[PDB]
Design a protein that fits this description.
The complex is a heterodimer.
Chain B (H helix, E strand, L loop, with lengths): L2 E8 L3 H12 L4 E5 L22 H13 L4 E5 L2 E7 L2 E6 L4 E9 L3 E4 L14 E2 L2 H4 L5 E7 L5 H7 L4 E6 L8 H9 L3 E3 L3 E5 L3 E4 L4 E3 L2 E4 L2 E4 L3 H4 L4 E3 L4 E3 L12 E3 L10 H21 L1
Parallel strand pairs in B: 1-2, 1-6, 2-3, 6-19, 8-15, 9-10, 9-15, 10-11
Antiparallel strand pairs in B: 4-5, 5-6, 7-16, 12-13, 13-14, 17-18
Helix pairs in contact in B: 1-2, 1-7
The chains are: B alpha/beta.
Bound molecules: flavin-adenine dinucleotide and chloride ion (CL).
Chain lengths: ~5, ~300
């Protein structure tokens, strides 16, 4: 991951 | 009238199949209701799933469905859930076909829908030369030229990440101006910034700018917004939170939503986004749904 992870 | 199940899974892709499989293996009656439109139906290959790297997404989905339905106590309907209600007799589901189904518990696994930037030519290239996730499609660009299509503050992060996969141009599209510190960071990552508004995408992945310049790329990335596939979560009063790229259904660390007996997995949850993540949190949701069946 919903983003950078 | 309506058929009774212990658990109904709404959505029959990777997350829903993984959840449904745990319940099937617990010898409970589980029904999957699936509308047949997976998020990844645009790319011809899937990557990043150990044991399935390179395989066709349709084949992955097909194998999973067949091995779930090998359990007599698992069933499938090709249909769309339009309305969900909480009654004393658990949950009641009404489908686009008119069918009603009832369950003690629900697993929401209906995925998200990509809302693509309004750029001429982008939609027809989606999943072929325009992508969302570099872990899924970066490798195959072979270290070539990559355009990051800017769409607000978060695109900066994408631009910083993309040099891992090739020479990156941050096409801000006259929408976001990196600050001083951001411009320096982008500079040391070797990211070129192009600020001109974009007219359209032509060729495979060539960007035509407002001044007529054309910049050819081997692939383009967008950090586009996404919506929930279904209002069902909202109808059941599940807490929905606004993430960086759109809404997700809130869950505890066992995949239970704010509404008891309703669980959620896959892209609609906070830490979804890839097939591997969906398989894992789907399995978690299924075991958790079963535990609640048994212990209340
Ligand atoms: C172009 C593209 C390429 C991608 N490539 C990769 C890759 O290579 N590797 C990777 O790990 N990830 C990839 N992804 C990400 C991946 O597609 C998702 O992480 C994953 O499919 C999510 O699974 P899900 O089971 O959470 O959602 P989905 O796969 O989107 O499936 C949800 C299902 O629920 C159904 N549904 C929706 N609403 C209803 C309703 N009201 N009633 C009944 N059914 C409903 C849908 O029709 C759909 O079948 C890619 C995404 C895109 C867009
Ligand atoms: Cl993608």
């Amino acid at each position: 991951x919903x983003x950078t992870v | 009238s309506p058929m009774l199940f212990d658990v109904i899974v709404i959505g029959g892709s990777h997350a829903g199949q993984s959840a449904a499989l745990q319940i099937a293996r617990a010898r409970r009656r589980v029904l999957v209701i699936d509308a047949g439109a997976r998020r990844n139906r645009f790319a011809s290959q899937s990557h990043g799933v150990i044991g399935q790297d390179g395989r066709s997404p349709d084949a992955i989905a097909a194998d999973g469905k067949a091995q779930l339905l090998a359990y007599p106590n698992a069933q499938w309907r090709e249909d769309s859930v339009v309305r969900a209600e909480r009654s004393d007799a658990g949950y009641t589901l009404i489908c686009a076909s008119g069918q009603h189904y009832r369950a003690c518990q629900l697993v929401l696994a209906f995925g998200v829908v990509d809302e693509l930037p309004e750029l001429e030519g982008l939609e027809e290239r989606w999943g072929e030369s325009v992508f969302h996730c570099p872990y899924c499609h970066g490798y195959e660009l072979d270290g070539g030229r990559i355009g990051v299509l800017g769409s607000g503050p978060l695109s900066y992060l994408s631009a910083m990440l993309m040099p891992e996969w090739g020479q990156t141009v941050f096409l801000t599209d006259a929408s976001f101006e990196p600050d001083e510190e951001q411009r320096e960071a982008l500079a040391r990552r070797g990211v070129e910034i192009v600020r001109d508004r974009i007219a359209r995408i032509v060729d495979r992945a060539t960007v035509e700018l407002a001044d007529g310049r054309r910049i050819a790329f081997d692939g383009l990335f967008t950090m586009n917004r996404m919506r929930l596939s279904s209002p069902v979560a909202e109808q059941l009063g599940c807490a929905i939170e606004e993430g960086p790229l759109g809404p997700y259904v809130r869950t505890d660390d066992a995949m239970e939503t704010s509404t008891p007996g309703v669980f959620a997995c896959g892209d609609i949850t906070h830490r979804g986004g890839t097939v591997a993540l969906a398989i894992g949190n789907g399995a978690l949701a299924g075991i958790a749904a079963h535990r609640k069946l048994v212990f209340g």
